[PDB]
Amino acid sequence: SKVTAVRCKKCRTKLALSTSFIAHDPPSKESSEGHFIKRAANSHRIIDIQESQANCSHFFIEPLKWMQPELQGKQELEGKFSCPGCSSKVGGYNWKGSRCSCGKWVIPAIHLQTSKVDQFPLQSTALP
RNA sequence: GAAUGUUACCGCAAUAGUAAUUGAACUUAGUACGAGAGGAACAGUUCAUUCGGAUAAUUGGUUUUUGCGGCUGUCUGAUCA
Ligand SMILES: [Zn+2]
C-alpha cells in the first residue's frame, strides 16, 4: 500500500504522516480484557459489564517535533493537546494509561483521536 | 347619605386586599467532563406561554350618523323630490 497522512477536521493543517499506527492486536476476549472493568470501592468488586466496541476509534503515534516544546514546557502527568493553528482539541498526553477506544493497557505512548480528525492519502486522488 | 360651628381645598394612613408566571433560542461552547461516542452550567441578550391592568395612533369588527350612493314593488299624473 501507499503512504498516508492524518490531519485535523474544521482546520486545514497537516498533523502527522505514515510509518506509525501499530495495530497492537485489539481482541483477546477471555473474561476481562474485552470488558470495561470498573472496580468498586472495596473487595475488587466489578459492577459494570460493558462489552468493548469493534471499531478502533484512536490513532497511536510517536512523539513529534511539534510535540517537543509542549513536552518540554510545564510537564505534568496527564493533560490535553491541540493544533497550533487552531484551538480544537485532538486528545491528551499520558504515560500511565489512556488505554485505547478498544481498551487495553499499553506501553507509554501518545494517542490521537479520530473524532474531529481525518486521514488522507499523500499522493493524488483516484479521480472517480 | 343625617350628625360633628358652616363651607371649600390640599393631605396623612390605621386597617383590608396584593400578582406575576413558565418555557425556549443565541452566546457561554461542541468548551468543562469523558479514552471516544456523546455532552453541560453561571453570567449576558432576544423572544415566547399563561395571567393582569389599561388603551384605541394603526388594523379588524360593529352602523339608527338611517351620512352618501344604488336597487326592487307600490303610491304621490310624468320629471325633480
Ligand atoms: Zn485545527
Ligand SMILES: [Zn+2]
Ligand atoms: Zn484498539
